[PDB]
Amino acid sequence: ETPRLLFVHAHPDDESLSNGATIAHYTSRGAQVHVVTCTLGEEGEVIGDRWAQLTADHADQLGGYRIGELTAALRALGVSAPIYLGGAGRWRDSGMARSQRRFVDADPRQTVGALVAIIRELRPHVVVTYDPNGGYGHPDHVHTHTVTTAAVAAAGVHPGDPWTVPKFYWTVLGLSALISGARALVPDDLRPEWVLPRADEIAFGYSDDGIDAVVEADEQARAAKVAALAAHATQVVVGPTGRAAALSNNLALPILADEHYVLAGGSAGARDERGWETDLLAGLGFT
C-alpha cells in the first residue's frame, strides 16, 4: 500500500520544530502523513505587536489565530489540513499567559479514546511523539507522550478494529547533530539579539548510542521546514539565511535537515554504520 505516518504533537509549531523535514521528506515521496495537534496554543505568547492583544491576558483569542498558522505550516510540509485531538478547541494548553478544559487535567478515557479512534481509522505504519520527558519537560509535551503511549498500546486492544502500530518512535534531539550544526553557523545566519544556547537550555538531548534512526532529508525538504517555521510567525523568527531560528527567548538553533528518533515499539529495519535506521519505514516492505 502507500505508507501511512502519524505525528502526535502538543502545540502548533511543534510539528515543524521537531519533524518538519521528515514530514516534507515523506509527503514529497507520496506517503500519507497526518499530524495530530492536542491543543490550539491558547496560552502562548506572541512575537511582535500586531497580534499582541490576542493573548490570554488581553482578548484570549490566540488559539483561534494559530489555526491558520498551523494550517499554513502543514501546507508548506505537504499535509493538507490540521487535526486537533478531540476537535479544535476541545482541550486547552498550559502556557505562560483558570480553565475547566486543560489538556493536562483531561479525563484519560477521552484523550486516549480520541487518539485510539484516530489510530484505528488511519492505521498508521509509524507513529511519532515525544519521549517520556516531553523534550524539555513542557507539561503538555509530557502529557502528549503519556496519551500517545497509552493510545498505541490500547489501539492494539475502545470501539473499532484493533490496529497494532508497526513502529512507534520518539522524536528526540540529536546532540552530535546539533553541535555540528551549530558549529557550521556563521554570524550572518543570526540576528544580533540571538545567542546560541548550550543544549541543556533547550532540550534533554540524546547521544549517538541512544538514537535508533535518522531521517536525513534533502534541501527541498529542509526548505519546506524553513517555510513551515516562517508560517508560525507569532512563535518563531527564522533568521536571514534560513539556517537558524529562535523562539521569543532569543535562543537560536540551526534549522537542520536531519531529524532523530528512538524506536520505542516495534522491530528495526536495516541500520547504517552508526547503528541507525535511515528510514522510519525500514523493514516494513515498502519499495
Q: Which residues are annotated as a binding site for Zn(2+)?
A: 11, 14, 141
Options 8-16, 20-28, 64-72, 121-129: segment touching Zn ion (CB under 5 A): 8-16
Burial state string for 84-120 with b = 16 or more CB within 10 A and e = fewer than 16: bbbeeebbbbbbeeeeeebbbebeeeebbbbbbbbbb
Options 7-15, 175-183, 196-204, 276-284: segment touching Zn ion (CB under 5 A): 7-15
Nearer CB in complex with Zn ion: 10/236: 10
Q: Give CA–CA dist 233/161, Å, rounded.
A: 40
Cell numbers for 256? 537542520
CB 68 within 8 A of CB 62: no
At its nearest, how many Å lie between Zn ion and the CB of residue 139? 10
Taking CB under 5 A as the criterion, the residue among 11, 92, 232, 243 binding Zn ion is: 11
The interface with Zn ion within residues 56-115 (CB under 5 A) comprises none
Site string for Zn ion, 153-172 (x = CB under 5 A): --------------------
Nearer CB in complex with Zn ion: 147/155: 147
The vertex-215 CA angle with 189 and 125, nearest 5°, equals 140
Taking CB under 5 A as the criterion, the residue among 10, 127, 213, 227 binding Zn ion is: 10
Q: Give CA–CA dist 135/150, Å, rounded.
A: 18
Taking CB under 5 A as the criterion, the residue among 5, 6, 7, 14 binding Zn ion is: 14
Q: Give CA–CA dist 213/228, Å, rounded.
A: 23
Q: Is 229 in the site for Zn ion (CB under 5 A)?
A: no
Nearer CB in complex with Zn ion: 9/167: 9
Collapse the DSSP code of 192 into the 3-class scheme (helix H, G, I; strand E, B; otherwise coil) and give the result.
coil
> Residues binding Zn ion: what is the number (CB under 5 A)?
3
Q: Contact residues for Zn ion (CB under 5 A)? A: 10-11, 14
